Write an enzyme that holds these catalytic residues in place. Structure first.
Site, PDB file in Angstrom:
ATOM      1  N   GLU A 137      47.004 -32.090 -74.289  1.00  0.00           N
ATOM      2  CA  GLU A 137      46.253 -30.965 -73.731  1.00  0.00           C
ATOM      3  C   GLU A 137      44.766 -31.255 -73.665  1.00  0.00           C
ATOM      4  O   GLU A 137      44.114 -30.878 -72.702  1.00  0.00           O
ATOM      5  CB  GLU A 137      46.497 -29.674 -74.520  1.00  0.00           C
ATOM      6  CG  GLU A 137      47.942 -29.177 -74.560  1.00  0.00           C
ATOM      7  CD  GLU A 137      48.401 -28.486 -73.270  1.00  0.00           C
ATOM      8  OE1 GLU A 137      47.618 -28.358 -72.313  1.00  0.00           O
ATOM      9  OE2 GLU A 137      49.573 -28.074 -73.200  1.00  0.00           O
ATOM     10  N   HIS A 172      46.719 -31.604 -69.335  1.00  0.00           N
ATOM     11  CA  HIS A 172      46.604 -30.184 -69.081  1.00  0.00           C
ATOM     12  C   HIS A 172      46.822 -29.883 -67.590  1.00  0.00           C
ATOM     13  O   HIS A 172      46.076 -30.385 -66.752  1.00  0.00           O
ATOM     14  CB  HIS A 172      45.208 -29.759 -69.509  1.00  0.00           C
ATOM     15  CG  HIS A 172      45.035 -28.278 -69.642  1.00  0.00           C
ATOM     16  ND1 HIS A 172      45.684 -27.537 -70.608  1.00  0.00           N
ATOM     17  CD2 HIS A 172      44.279 -27.399 -68.931  1.00  0.00           C
ATOM     18  CE1 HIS A 172      45.340 -26.264 -70.486  1.00  0.00           C
ATOM     19  NE2 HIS A 172      44.493 -26.156 -69.474  1.00  0.00           N
ATOM     20  N   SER A 195      47.742 -21.927 -68.835  1.00  0.00           N
ATOM     21  CA  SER A 195      46.415 -21.981 -69.440  1.00  0.00           C
ATOM     22  C   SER A 195      45.737 -20.591 -69.520  1.00  0.00           C
ATOM     23  O   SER A 195      46.268 -19.703 -70.178  1.00  0.00           O
ATOM     24  CB  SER A 195      45.536 -23.041 -68.781  1.00  0.00           C
ATOM     25  OG  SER A 195      44.533 -23.334 -69.737  1.00  0.00           O
TER      26      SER A 195
END
Ligand SMILES: *[C@@H]1O[C@H](CO)[C@@H](O)[C@H](O)[C@H]1NC(C)=O
Ligand SMILES: *[C@@H]1O[C@H](CO)[C@@H](O)[C@H](O)[C@H]1NC(C)=O
Ligand SMILES: *[C@@H]1O[C@H](CO)[C@@H](O)[C@H](O)[C@H]1NC(C)=O
Ligand SMILES: *[C@@H]1O[C@H](CO)[C@@H](O)[C@H](O)[C@H]1NC(C)=O
EC number: 3.1.1.7
Lengths: 528, 532
Positions: free
Chosen positions: A324, A437, A197
């Site tokens: 995500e 995520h 990320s």
């Protein structure tokens, strides 16, 4: 002795730790910079001043000063991401795991945490390096970097708060590894940086930036790339937000130095309390203090550096998760809950798209809305929910990563692409949220190998094969020992699924939506 | 005697024609207007002034002066649409088919041909009205009207060539039916106007125009609606094409009067030889001389009229064919032939979208391209062919018609929508063309009833039920027979949006015809072009 290592800045003492019936060496909380405190708040890091005697490297360091999530108190799925140590501005430390007995000059992997440039810690149960270090016989380093205003307040022109200092923290940590890892059995010529990320974006930023290129061999990017819409801002927007951070705290705004001195007398947490206020829009997947396109760390625009091939030419291994966006809808978009199926009315869908593409004009919003609405079944709450979910993920992670991979493969020396879509059996978030995520991280870090973590046997096989792909790539530039993960090429564009089922090869990951986000929407927004 | 009828304009003598081993009365080539020749080219038409003695109404009249297609000489597929009688500016005639023996006061259907407002004739074999009139017991009229320049040269401001006169031609034929059809056993209170393509647009235009509303009861639009992108132009663009028609012919352009005077001195074929040269772009499914939004025949913008309910409120029946676009890609876009599968390269795809949406800026082109390209499979010649086929159809026929149907239904008194998707067994065009623009017509006019034409038995059944829907609709405002046992074509409602398919299989009811694409064409694309 094995636990006593002599480094260029002084002696450190690790601790032998147990892993899966067996033991290895861990050197926790080793300082790599001076404490960026007082006058040093907002300034570039300075190399740690060497100390005499023996640094106690047996326990985790402090975490950087960050916003702390408390939407769901006690809840393990939100809390596994929060600081687990005391928070403090004195937080620039790194951790190392070395297999026992100490290898000669082995592959090094450096972990870089995500958290949107506004949070993260190196010390989380999910980033515990022992499994990967032990299982794959690598030296594992996790670094740290300043986040939020502390890491990314950008007053361009100043040398007191230049911006990007958090990326420079990471660079200082890599420099230290360059200088010292040989003493831990690490091979400074075979280090892979990897992160997820904000960390996969950070990795990509070091691939770009001239000053970082020489501090590592290869790179893995999980669910993030440097060109992410949320991962950087212009000098102007940085200045704008920083000023607005001053205004919120009744600071003298007359000049940069008065602003800076004012911001420096505030308690850390006075800055965090107002951090979200400086954003320009009601938004989701948008963070206040992030990297700046400064002319320094980044010579030109990210786009132009991609096009001219102004970047490290090496192997990269990268990919994305299937859902995500669901974490960010749950936190900021009307209609979603943790304790329900979250069916989304047509009304909430619309306000969801405005949140999600907060820089779009009304034509852009119509475009996005059309591209993601089934007009036979527009009142279907599940299709609305899944559609919002895909908007967030396509726009913020998947399509930016695809743009990057297409640009990079054109000049690089080996691309490997994955799409991770295994929904963990022991997941505590609700089904609607899908493959979330961050939830590939558990597998990358070996957690399914620990029996009391209550994972399935084939989840342990999958995490074993991921770890083995990751470390084999780290070691050679190829996740395959010579069934085959093929190279992504600009012609064929192959990637693989990563799940418990046997390996499937596909082509053109989300091409249809990514042409919309990478080519058509930017064009319409530039035009109107 | 059945064959001699006295109309308000003079006497008329029909002829007995055989139909399907029976017989009926036909009155062919009856004049309804003064021949628009000489100083009356371009002018509003004038009522046929009455004649004495007996008009021989036993043969088909002349066809209006038009571009004649000769891309495939001798080919029945294209030639069936060409004029089958001598062309002449003296062409304003109508035809009537009347059951024998003559009904007391029965349902009337007036056919309005299409052909892009630049062509068409009432005398084609496919418009032979004997089978419909015979089978359904209706009085069947076919009118004519001036096409191309002669019918739509539009110099707004001038009263010598004001524009829309082809549409006024149509109005006069309906006025004549209103006045005289009672004498043929027709009921002037129960007339339905129907047509296809420019024909369907015309019908919708009569629904809209206040001067036409009172001349018919009900309406059927086939593959065409008033708001079609090719069916009308502004006064500005009409004046521009009119002036450019002059420029091509070497005309004094100092004034409308000299311009018109010059144009009135050219032989018809000279006007037609340069007809296509006045279009603003390289295009497909664009036609030079079409209706104008003039502020008289249409009071305001078609859109504003639709939104305000400024239109005749009645029942309508309407629909489209599955592959509206294929005819026009064949004639005008690179990569298509009638002798191959017409697999389209990506290059030819791009140049095909530009040709299909010629008004669009570059961004508009990108949007269309994105909307119809499968990006996993962009070099697939079959999918490029079919996508282009859908683009032309969706932009030009289907989505316009859907906009009309949704707007109309908000105020009207009954909507019936259909999707004709039957590919005729005996069709001479290649299979890639599918269900082609115009090919529902032979079914509407009952041609499959005639054994020599070698249609299947199930095609005859299809023709018979299509004719029955149409005429039952003309009779009552509803295609369904009361208290029948047969499957029921439901009303299109604004909430529910139902329509049926029209083919040889049992009836499927569906909802929201081509919604996904039609949102793109009707809402999103217009927003985008209007941003600039
Ligand atoms: C290092 O710190 C830990 C706990 O804070 C302590 O238990 C350990 O003994 C220390 N090491 C030495 C030898 O000072
Ligand atoms: C990597 O670089 C070398 C030479 O510079 C080349 O031979 C090799 O094929 C490259 N590999 C790929 C997959 O680009
Ligand atoms: C009308 O013309 C047709 C065809 O030339 C002919 O058969 C018919 O006898 C004519 N009628 C009269 C009464 O002149
Ligand atoms: C048509 O009009 C009549 C009376 O004005 C009304 O009762 C009837 O319901 C209408 N039909 C439809 C289907 O709109």
């Amino acid at each position: 002795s094995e636990l006593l290592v002599n480094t260029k800045s002084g002696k450190v003492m690790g601790t032998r730790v147990p892993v899966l019936s067996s033991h290895i060496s861990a050197f926790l909380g080793i300082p790599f910079a001076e404490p960026p405190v007082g006058n040093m708040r907002f300034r570039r890091p300075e190399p740690k001043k060497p100390w005499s005697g023996v640094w106690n490297a047996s326990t985790y360091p402090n975490n950087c000063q960050q916003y702390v999530d408390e939407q769901f108190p006690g809840f393990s799925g939100s809390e596994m991401w929060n600081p687990n140590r005391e928070m403090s501005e004195d937080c620039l430390y790194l951790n190392i795991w070395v297999p026992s007995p100490r290898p000669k000059s082995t592959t090094v992997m450096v972990w870089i945490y995500g958290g949107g440039f506004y949070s993260g810690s190196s010390t989380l149960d999910v980033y515990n390096g022992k499994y990967l270090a032990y299982t794959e016989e690598v030296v594992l380093v996790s670094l740290s970097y300043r986040v939020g205003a502390f890491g990314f307040l950008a007053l361009h022109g100043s040398q007191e708060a230049p911006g990007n200092v958090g990326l420079l923290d990471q660079r200082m940590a890599l420099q230290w590894v360059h200088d010292n890892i040989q003493f831990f059995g690490g091979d400074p010529k075979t280090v892979t940086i990897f992160g997820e990320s904000a960390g996969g974006a950070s990795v990509g930023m070091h691939i770009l930036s001239p000053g970082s290129r020489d501090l590592f061999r290869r790179a893995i990017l999980q669910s993030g790339s440097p060109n992410c819409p949320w991962a950087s801002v212009s000098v102007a927007e940085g200045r704008r937000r920083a000023v607005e951070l001053g205004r919120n705290l009744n600071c003298n705004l007359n000049s940069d130095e008065e602003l800076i001195h004012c911001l420096r007398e505030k308690k850390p947490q006075e800055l965090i309390d107002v951090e979200w206020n400086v954003l320009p829009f009601d938004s989701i997947f948008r963070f206040s203090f992030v990297p700046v396109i400064d002319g320094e760390f980044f010579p030109t625009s990210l786009e132009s550096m991609l096009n001219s091939g102004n970047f490290k030419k090496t192997q990269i291994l990268l990919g994305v998760n299937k859902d995500e966006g669901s974490f960010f809808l749950l936190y900021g978009a009307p209609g979603f809950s943790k304790d329900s199926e979250s069916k989304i009315s047509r009304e909430d869908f619309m306000s969801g798209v405005k949140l999600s593409v907060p820089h779009a004009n009304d034509l852009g919003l119509d475009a996005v809305t059309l591209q993601y609405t089934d007009w036979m079944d527009d009142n279907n709450g599940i299709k609305n929910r899944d559609g919002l979910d895909d908007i967030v993920g396509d726009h913020n992670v998947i399509c930016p990563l695809m743009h990057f991979v297409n640009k990079y493969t054109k000049f690089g020396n080996g691309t490997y692409l994955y799409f991770f879509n295994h929904r963990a059996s022991n997941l505590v978030w609700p089904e609607w949220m899908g493959v979330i995520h961050g939830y590939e991280i558990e597998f990358v870090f070996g957690l399914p190998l620990v029996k009391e973590l209550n994972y399935t046997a084939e989840e342990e096989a999958l995490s074993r094969r991921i770890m083995h792909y990751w470390a084999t790539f780290a070691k050679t530039g190829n996740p395959n020992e010579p069934s085959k993960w093929p190279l992504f090429t600009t012609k064929e564009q192959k990637f693989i699924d990563l799940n418990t089922e046997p390996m499937k090869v596909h082509q053109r990951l989300r091409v249809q939506m990514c042409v919309f986000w990478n080519q058509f929407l930017p064009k319409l927004l530039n035009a109107t």
